[PDB]
Protein backbone atom coordinates (compact mmCIF):
# COMPACT_ATOMS: atom_id res chain seq x y z
CA UNK A 1 0.00 0.00 0.00
CA UNK A 2 3.01 2.65 0.35
CA UNK A 3 3.13 3.62 -2.86
CA UNK A 4 1.13 0.34 -4.35
CA UNK A 5 -2.58 1.24 -4.69
CA UNK A 6 -0.98 4.47 -6.51
CA UNK A 7 0.94 2.12 -8.87
CA UNK A 8 -1.73 -0.33 -9.78
CA UNK A 9 -4.60 1.82 -10.66
CA UNK A 10 -2.49 4.27 -12.80
CA UNK A 11 -4.76 3.80 -15.25
CA UNK A 12 -7.83 5.07 -13.46
CA UNK A 13 -6.71 7.45 -11.59
CA UNK A 14 -5.60 9.68 -14.34
CA UNK A 15 -9.01 9.41 -16.38
CA UNK A 16 -10.00 11.25 -13.13
CA UNK A 17 -7.63 14.11 -13.52
CA UNK A 18 -9.08 17.27 -16.24
CA UNK A 19 -6.83 18.14 -18.63
CA UNK A 20 -8.11 21.42 -19.07
CA UNK A 21 -7.13 24.78 -16.61
CA UNK A 22 -10.70 25.88 -16.02
CA UNK A 23 -11.86 22.31 -15.47
CA UNK A 24 -9.31 21.08 -13.59
CA UNK A 25 -9.47 24.41 -11.01
CA UNK A 26 -13.06 23.62 -10.69
CA UNK A 27 -12.44 19.62 -9.21
CA UNK A 28 -13.77 19.05 -5.91
CA UNK A 29 -11.00 18.31 -3.93
CA UNK A 30 -11.47 16.47 -1.06
CA UNK A 31 -9.28 18.20 1.88
CA UNK A 32 -10.37 15.96 4.13
CA UNK A 33 -7.51 13.80 2.92
CA UNK A 34 -4.95 16.52 2.33
CA UNK A 35 -3.99 15.74 6.39
CA UNK A 36 -0.82 16.78 8.51
CA UNK A 37 0.81 13.60 6.84
CA UNK A 38 0.43 13.80 3.45
CA UNK A 39 2.23 17.08 3.49
CA UNK A 40 5.51 15.82 4.97
CA UNK A 41 4.81 13.01 3.09
CA UNK A 42 4.82 13.87 -0.38
CA UNK A 43 3.38 17.34 -0.82
CA UNK A 44 5.75 19.64 1.47
CA UNK A 45 9.15 17.41 -0.62
CA UNK A 46 7.50 17.83 -4.06
CA UNK A 47 6.70 21.89 -3.48
CA UNK A 48 10.60 22.26 -2.41
CA UNK A 49 11.80 20.21 -5.05
CA UNK A 50 10.11 22.22 -7.61
CA UNK A 51 11.07 25.11 -6.29
CA UNK A 52 14.69 25.23 -7.11
CA UNK A 53 14.09 24.45 -10.78
CA UNK A 54 12.27 28.12 -10.55
CA UNK A 55 14.57 30.10 -8.43
CA UNK A 56 17.59 27.89 -7.23
CA UNK A 57 12.92 29.08 1.32
CA UNK A 58 10.73 30.97 2.99
CA UNK A 59 8.22 31.31 0.35
CA UNK A 60 7.64 27.18 0.30
CA UNK A 61 6.26 26.99 4.15
CA UNK A 62 3.61 29.55 2.81
CA UNK A 63 2.38 27.59 0.05
CA UNK A 64 2.11 24.59 2.22
CA UNK A 65 -0.06 26.57 4.99
CA UNK A 66 -2.52 27.97 1.62
CA UNK A 67 -3.16 24.00 1.13
CA UNK A 68 -3.54 23.28 4.14
CA UNK A 69 -6.05 26.25 4.44
CA UNK A 70 -8.18 24.36 2.02
CA UNK A 71 -7.61 27.55 -0.35
CA UNK A 72 -9.05 27.95 -4.26
CA UNK A 73 -6.33 27.17 -6.76
CA UNK A 74 -6.29 30.72 -8.77
CA UNK A 75 -5.96 32.46 -5.10
CA UNK A 76 -2.59 30.60 -4.24
CA UNK A 77 -2.04 31.29 -8.32
CA UNK A 78 -2.10 34.92 -7.82
CA UNK A 79 0.05 34.98 -4.67
CA UNK A 80 2.82 32.77 -6.23
CA UNK A 81 2.68 35.21 -9.50
CA UNK A 82 4.09 38.16 -7.53
CA UNK A 83 7.39 35.90 -6.95
CA UNK A 84 7.06 33.64 -10.26
CA UNK A 85 6.00 34.94 -13.44
CA UNK A 86 4.01 33.16 -15.64
CA UNK A 87 5.91 30.63 -14.28
CA UNK A 88 3.69 30.39 -11.62
CA UNK A 89 0.58 29.61 -13.60
CA UNK A 90 2.28 26.57 -14.67
CA UNK A 91 3.18 25.77 -11.35
CA UNK A 92 -0.37 24.95 -9.37
CA UNK A 93 -1.71 23.18 -12.94
CA UNK A 94 1.51 20.99 -12.46
CA UNK A 95 0.66 20.87 -7.95
CA UNK A 96 -3.07 20.58 -8.43
CA UNK A 97 -2.56 17.17 -11.21
CA UNK A 98 -0.68 16.47 -8.02
CA UNK A 99 -3.26 16.76 -5.34
CA UNK A 100 -6.43 15.35 -7.25
CA UNK A 101 -3.91 11.77 -7.82
CA UNK A 102 -3.16 11.86 -4.21
CA UNK A 103 -6.34 12.35 -2.82
CA UNK A 104 -7.91 10.31 -5.14
CA UNK A 105 -5.51 7.38 -4.52
CA UNK A 106 -6.30 6.89 -1.08
CA UNK A 107 -9.83 6.60 -1.45
CA UNK A 108 -9.35 3.77 -3.57
CA UNK A 109 -8.65 1.83 -0.60
CA UNK A 110 -11.77 0.34 -0.14
Same mark, same amino acid.
Given at each position: ????? *????????????? =??????????????? /? +????? @???????????? %?????? =?? /??? /??? *???????????? +???????? @???????????? &???? @? =? @?? *?? %?? &?
Amino acid at each position: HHHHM *KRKHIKSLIEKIP =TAKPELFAYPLDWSI /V +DSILM @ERRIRPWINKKI %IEYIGA =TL /VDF /VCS *KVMAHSSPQSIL +DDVAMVLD @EEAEVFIVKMWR &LLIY @E =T @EA *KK %IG &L
